[PDB]
Amino acid sequence: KLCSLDNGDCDQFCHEEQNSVVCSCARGYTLADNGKACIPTGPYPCGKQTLE
Amino acid sequence: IVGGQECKDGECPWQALLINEENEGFCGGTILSEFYILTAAHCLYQAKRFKVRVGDRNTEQEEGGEAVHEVEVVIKHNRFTKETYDFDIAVLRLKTPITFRMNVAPACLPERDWAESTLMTQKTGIVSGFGRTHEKGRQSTRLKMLEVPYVDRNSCKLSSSFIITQNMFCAGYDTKQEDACQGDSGGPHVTRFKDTYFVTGIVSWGEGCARKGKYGIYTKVTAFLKWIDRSMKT
Ligand SMILES: CN1CCN=C1c1cccc(Oc2nc(Oc3cc(C(=N)N)ccc3O)c(F)c(N(C)CC(=O)O)c2F)c1
Ligand SMILES: [Ca+2]
Ligand SMILES: [Cl-]
DSSP, rough: OOGTTGEEEEEEEEEEEEEEEEEEEEEEEEEOOOOSSSSSSSSSOOOOOOOO | OOSSEEETTEEEEEEEEOOOOTEEEEEEEEEEESSSSEEOGGGGGGOOOOOEEOSBSSSSSOOOEEEEEEEEEOOOOOTOOTTTTTOOOOOESSSSSSBBTBOOOOOOOOOHIIIIIIIISEEEEEESOBBBTTTTTOOSSOEEEEEEOOOOOHHHHOOSSSSOOOEEEESSSSSSSBBBBBOTTOEEEEEEETTTTEEEEEEOOSSSOOOOOOOOEEEEEEGHHHHHHHHTTO
């Protein structure tokens, strides 16, 4: 399944390479050490409601 | 927007409103970054000159976070056609940058493959705007949003009296009288994935508003991601 199985555990973009999953993020985000999570780099990252 | 609910404080931060010379919101847009606004090519024909307002949720009241920006460059899709509304997409380069804040933030541009297999396969998307609350009613003074389910392509084709091209998709309810409407055009259609909102469409057109058996038609943004990207390197 890879990306077909719960987005391959990626927070955002998931791609399959040589039968494995590769996660990536939108601009303004940094991929976490776990190679899955997307960490905002600033206070107003894209795609986030301003509930502050 | 016919139906749905008011966008609460900070809920649709990427909403942009194109305003004419009398300061009347005539179309919507989506904030893509500090300098760029995504809108429909057909809205360009609705005003000889227009500006862009961000951070607005109520046209009749001062909230304090609103800001108007002039457009320095309009980048229309050169293949846009009025007879079909095909390629209904345009990017606006602002003269001055937008500073993000409460109610002012960009929506994320996704990557095409992931967007089409994952975002567009979600049950629903969210559309928003200051458009008409009723097909023959008045435009809203309050920013509204509405969750619209994706509609199967064939059902999409069969419902329409006009050509539905591959650069378009249907969203809405066949039954329920909830839909985008006039004035919402050029506005955002986003899909939420794990608390993050990605741009998936641009409010394009529709046979009336909220009619049974009819859907709202949107520009398929995923087919223009490379075009948008190139435009943003203007
Ligand atoms: C698909 N093609 C190809 C050529 N023409 C069309 C075409 C045919 C019918 C309508 C059309 O667009 C049009 N759509 C309208 O309303 C909208 C409805 C919806 C919605 N229900 N989701 C979203 C955005 C809108 O702007 C309109 F108000 C008009 N108006 C400006 C008039 C009005 O209804 O008041 C219109 F021409 C365009
Ligand atoms: Ca206001
Ligand atoms: Cl601003």
